[PDB]
Design a protein around this nucleic acid. Structure first.
Ligand SMILES: [Zn+2]
Lengths: 79, 49, 59, 182, 192, 136, 126
RNA sequence: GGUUCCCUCAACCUGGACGGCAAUCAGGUGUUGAGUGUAAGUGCACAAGGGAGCUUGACUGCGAGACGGACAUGUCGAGCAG
């Protein structure tokens, strides 16, 4: 007798890369995910594989819009 | 091979620009399609080789 | 209403053996047609050659 | 400057009769017919596609307009039916052409039925809609007996504004439907 | 029914939490809460042996009279927190009431009487809901099974209620079910 | 013996044996009950052996309720083999019982026979237990 | 008594238009620099607005309720052209050069298109 | 596949020639229980699901900034011009 199991795949390192309050540049990756668990907000775009990246520099802020979790970028002001 | 690799060549300059795959049972004929040709500089009809 | 797909439609005229006549539109190309039983003729509505031979030979 | 006689009769005769019988509060509540749909569900065309051509041609003659070609929305093993093939046709009638079809069906088509005993008044649909079926296509003058191939019937339905069954019969009776005394 | 309220001494707690409640219970006390239409809860402490005496004789829905540091209050027992194993009273919710007020209360129903000898009496619903006055809640309700034959459903609508008491739960609750007594062959096929 | 008709997953981890029971700690159907006082896996064979002990004692009249079902399976690998090469095939079905849980129930006209019948069943179970009633 | 059974055509028409107007708004939106031109068409009149969606405030507005538009002797399409010209005058007076057309959930063509083409040659570009 | 526009299922109840639990028609309730080429998971009714018209971006030269990482690999990307 033996086992017919024993396979698996490499961990894909998903999750949230920049948390709320972090200051980011433009084009920087924020969330890596399979579906749209988080939806794009203001100054945030959706990649081909549903990655969320920043469209403009600022500070990350998580919000909600009609029951949808969204990620927004707020423009920290110049000194 | 059901889905062999095919090469699309420009009608005008005859340069081979693109390569792709098509089903040779669903599409028994030579694929005809319009693609950008760098040599001519414009979109030209391309045909399978 | 699309032009070249519907059957050619003609204003017709219906005639019955009791003298009752109509004027309706149908697909009959002749523009007229005769019916041997109509609303006024039928016993079910009004409540009222083979059988002609019963009264012919026997009577 | 022309109206069908059923529409002509309905405007000043049938409407006033309904008003007195039920005593509505507004003239916008007067029941009336909305559309007539004529169906021929072949079902045997799954065995031979050429069968659907008979139903397509007949409905254009009977009703006066081209039908659809309905396609199965499910694959059923027991019927040997695969999704996506013609299974029936359908014609909907509105406006004037509804009024002529209702005229010819009542005046001409129904009496030609051999051993005709009227139509049951219990065939109503919940909220004042009527439907009935035919076993043949030989009761219409537009079709000709010379060109027939085999028996094939329709499924006639009428959609009315009537709220429930009580006004459904009253509207259809005043139109002149042959309802059995039941 | 007129019930003389039971007098109980209550002390306002100085410290709350789980460290202070455990210490309070170690001294023969029970934490309590007094909310209601006063709309500002009071955190009290009650004697453990005196509280249990009131519940033992006058039922679970006992009307009370708390002496909160010199102020008299009419209160009704709303809920209890009882340990599954040690069978304690870990807490007590108290609702403020006033005379002439209607409250919704679950009282217990009891089955008295001996039925036909070839029957087994099975009670489905333990308690039913009523709506009585604050000081007029019946301590218990009774039903009679005397000569009841074979399969009958005694329903919550047929319970005899005193005056001023109105049934709240629907009148189709199967409260008492009398059925034929199972035989030896019917026992061996139940739960196999 | 009690056996589920089907289960999605046939090989499972062992049920945890920590804490006391949250629900099922009160007698609801009958007049007398058996309340557990220890953690154990009650096998489907000890339930059959314990509810036949109640049946014999009360003879004809009365009704018995079993409030726990042997749902969760435990495996057992083939005898006299080294460790490794898979996980064993399921062999017995158990019920995770925590202290405070009420296992059996009984309705019977008189009390002395009812409490004796339930005592005959506590001696078939691998735990300590006590007889509880519907009253407070 | 009387009790309606189904849904009126007006109820179906109203929810269907807002259904296909919110689909439109998933792309177009108003800004202070590029405001959104919203059109409401009815069986009798036609209304327009110039909305800034960051604040949710209306910049300019014209409608066929006005007495000047009612003086036109043409048909409904003639009233749309008058309204289309009156929104390019008020928008450019307020300081607006570019807009985006929110067709309101109606099919583009007829009264909606005549209004847009009248406001295109009048100065507003979109 | 790209784009533009339109639509809402599964299930149940009621009425209908063959026709039945289930084919096609009609009316009502129905907020996602249907479906997404293909396993599972995260999603999708705002539709990523259903239908139609045109079409080849299933491009050429590039690419700020990032994810992940022993290394070699792998992945996302606004935007500029033809
Ligand atoms: Zn070329």
């Amino acid at each position: 007798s033996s086992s017919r199991n024993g396979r698996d795949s490499a961990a894909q390192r998903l999750g949230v890369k920049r948390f709320g309050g972090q200051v980011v540049k433009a084009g920087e990756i924020l969330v890596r995910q399979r579906g749209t668990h988080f939806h794009p907000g203001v100054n945030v775009g959706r990649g081909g594989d549903d990655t969320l990246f920043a469209l403009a520099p600022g500070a990350v802020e998580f919000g909600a819009k009609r029951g949808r979790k969204t990620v927004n970028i707020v423009p920290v002001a110049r000194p | 091979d059901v889905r062999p690799k095919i090469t699309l060549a420009c009608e005008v300059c005859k340069h081979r620009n693109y390569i792709t795959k098509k089903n040779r049972r669903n599409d028994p004929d030579r694929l005809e399609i319009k693609k950008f040709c760098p040599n001519c500089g414009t979109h030209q009809p391309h045909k399978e080789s | 209403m699309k032009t070249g797909i519907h059957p050619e439609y003609v204003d017709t005229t219906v005639q019955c053996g009791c003298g009752h006549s109509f004027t309706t539109r149908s697909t009959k190309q002749s523009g007229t047609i005769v019916v041997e039983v109509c609303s006024q003729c039928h016993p079910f509505y009004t409540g009222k050659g083979r059988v002609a031979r019963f009264e012919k030979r026997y009577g | 400057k022309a109206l069908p006689r059923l529409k002509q009769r309905y405007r000043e005769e049938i409407r006033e009769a309904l008003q007195q019988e039920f005593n509505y509060a507004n003239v916008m509540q007067i029941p009336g017919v909305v559309k007539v749909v004529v169906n021929m569900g072949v079902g045997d065309a799954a065995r031979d596609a050429k069968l659907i051509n008979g139903a397509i041609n007949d409905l254009a003659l009977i009703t006066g307009q081209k039908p659809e070609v309905r396609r199965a929305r499910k694959s059923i093993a027991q019927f040997k039916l695969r999704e996506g093939m013609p299974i029936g046709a359908r014609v909907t009638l509105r406006g004037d052409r509804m009024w002529e079809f209702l005229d010819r069906l009542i005046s001409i088509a129904l009496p030609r039925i051999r051993d005709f005993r009227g139509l049951s008044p219990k065939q109503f649909d919940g909220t004042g809609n009527y439907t009935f079926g035919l076993n043949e296509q030989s009761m219409f003058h537009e079709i000709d007996v010379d060109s027939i191939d085999r028996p094939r019937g329709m499924d006639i339905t009428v959609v009315t504004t009537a709220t429930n069954d009580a006004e459904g019969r009253a509207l259809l009776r005043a139109l002149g439907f042959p309802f059995k005394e039941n | 029914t007129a019930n003389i309220p039971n007098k109980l001494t209550a002390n306002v707690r100085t410290r709350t939490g789980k460290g202070a409640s455990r210490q309070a219970r170690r001294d023969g006390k029970v934490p309590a809460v007094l909310y209601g239409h006063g709309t500002d809860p009071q955190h009290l402490e009650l004697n453990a042996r005196d509280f249990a005496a009131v519940l033992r004789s006058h039922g679970t829905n006992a009307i009370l009279t708390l002496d909160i540091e010199g102020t008299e209050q009419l209160a009704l027992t709303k809920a209890l927190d009882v340990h599954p194993i040690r069978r304690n009273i870990q807490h007590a919710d108290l609702l403020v009431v006033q005379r002439g007020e209607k409250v919704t209360v679950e009282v217990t129903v009891l089955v008295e009487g001996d039925a036909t000898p070839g029957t087994l009496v099975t009670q489905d619903a333990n308690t039913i809901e009523i709506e009585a006055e604050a000081l007029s809640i019946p301590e218990q309700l009774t039903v009679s099974v005397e000569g009841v034959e074979a399969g009958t459903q005694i329903t919550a609508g047929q319970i005899s209620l005193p005056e001023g008491v109105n049934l709240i739960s629907d009148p189709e609750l199967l409260v008492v079910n009398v059925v034929e007594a199972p035989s030896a062959e019917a026992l061996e096929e139940e739960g196999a | 013996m009690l056996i589920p008709r089907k289960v999605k997953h046939r090989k499972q981890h062992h049920p945890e044996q920590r804490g006391i029971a949250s629900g099922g700690t009160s007698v609801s159907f009958g007049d007398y009950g058996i309340q557990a006082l220890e953690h154990a896996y009650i096998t489907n064979r000890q339930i059959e052996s314990a509810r036949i002990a109640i049946n014999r004692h009360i003879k004809r009249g009365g009704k018995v309720w079993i409030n726990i079902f042997p749902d969760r399976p435990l495996t057992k690998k083939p005898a006299e083999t080294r460790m490794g090469s898979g996980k064993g095939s399921p062999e017995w079905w158990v019920a995770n019982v925590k202290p405070g849980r009420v296992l059996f129930e009984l309705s019977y006209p008189d009390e002395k026979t009812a409490r004796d019948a339930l005592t005959r069943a506590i001696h078939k179970l691998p735990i300590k237990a006590r007889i509880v009633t519907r009253e407070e | 008594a009387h009790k309606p059974v189904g849904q009126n055509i007006s109820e179906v028409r109203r929810n269907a238009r807002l259904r296909r107007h919110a689909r439109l708004r998933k792309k177009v939106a108003g800004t202070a620099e590029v405001p959104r031109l919203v059109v409401n068409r009815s069986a009798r009149h036609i209304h327009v607005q110039l909305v800034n969606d960051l604040n949710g405030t209306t910049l300019a507005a014209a409608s066929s309720i006005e007495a000047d538009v009612r003086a036109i002797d043409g048909d409904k399409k003639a009233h749309s052209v008058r309204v289309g010209q009156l929104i390019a005058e008020r928008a450019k007076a307020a300081g607006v050069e570019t807009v985006v057309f929110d067709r309101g959930g109606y099919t583009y063509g007829g009264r909606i298109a005549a209004l847009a083409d009248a406001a295109r040659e009048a100065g507003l570009k979109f």
